[PDB]
Amino acid sequence: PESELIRQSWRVVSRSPLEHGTVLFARLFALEPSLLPLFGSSPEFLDHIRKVMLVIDAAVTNVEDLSSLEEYLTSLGRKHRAVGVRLSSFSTVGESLLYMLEKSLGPDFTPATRTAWSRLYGAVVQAMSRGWD
Numbered sequence: 001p002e003s004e005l006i007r008q009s010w011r012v013v014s015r016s017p018l019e020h021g022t023v024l025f026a027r028l029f030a031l032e033p034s035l036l037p038l039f040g041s042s043p044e045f046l047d048h049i050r051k052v053m054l055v056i057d058a059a060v061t062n063v064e065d066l067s068s069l070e071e072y073l074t075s076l077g078r079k080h081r082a083v084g085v086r087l088s089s090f091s092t093v094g095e096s097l098l099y100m101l102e103k104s105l106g107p108d109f110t111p112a113t114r115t116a117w118s119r120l121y122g123a124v125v126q127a128m129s130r131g132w133d
């Protein structure tokens with residue numbers, strides 16, 4: 001019931017991944033402008049947006065069994081720690097993801113859809129958090 005809400009809402013976003021990823025990152029810097037220096041240039045920034053959207057694509061494909069990605073996501077967390085990202089900043093990324101989905105879906109972004117996404121994103125960050133251990 002939750003795996004279908006995620007798949008169906010992600011299909012709408014998948015129609016334009018850099019456009020939607022760009023809304024997510026614009027929200028992220030509005031909330032936590034201190035993050036912007038962690039990036040490099042414009043092509044590096046835009047390519048990172050594509051990389052984030054591909055990781056969420058993999059999380060959506062594996063939504064019924066995210067443990068199959070836990071080692072990959074742990075390594076991703078280690079890489080983010082290595083380049084100076086604080087684990088706390090991932091809560092603001094989650095708020096920015098839910099913002100971008102609400103703007104993309106409007107009234108189709110039901111509380112059940114939001115809650116499903118909150119849980120999926122939380123499982124992704126729980127796996128990544130191991131990289132800060």
Ligand code: HEM
Nearest residue numbers: 035038039044048051052055056079080083085089090093
């Ligand atoms: C505040 C949040 C974040 C910051 C500051 C950040 C920053 C970075 C930086 C500096 C890199 C290395 C340079 C690069 O490849 O462009 C990187 C790599 C990456 N990030 Fe992020 N990141 C954030 C959140 C995320 C999230 C939430 C995901 C996925 C859900 C993600 C996916 C990636 C991927 C796939 C890479 C490439 C790793 C590799 O080469 O093996 N990022 N990120």
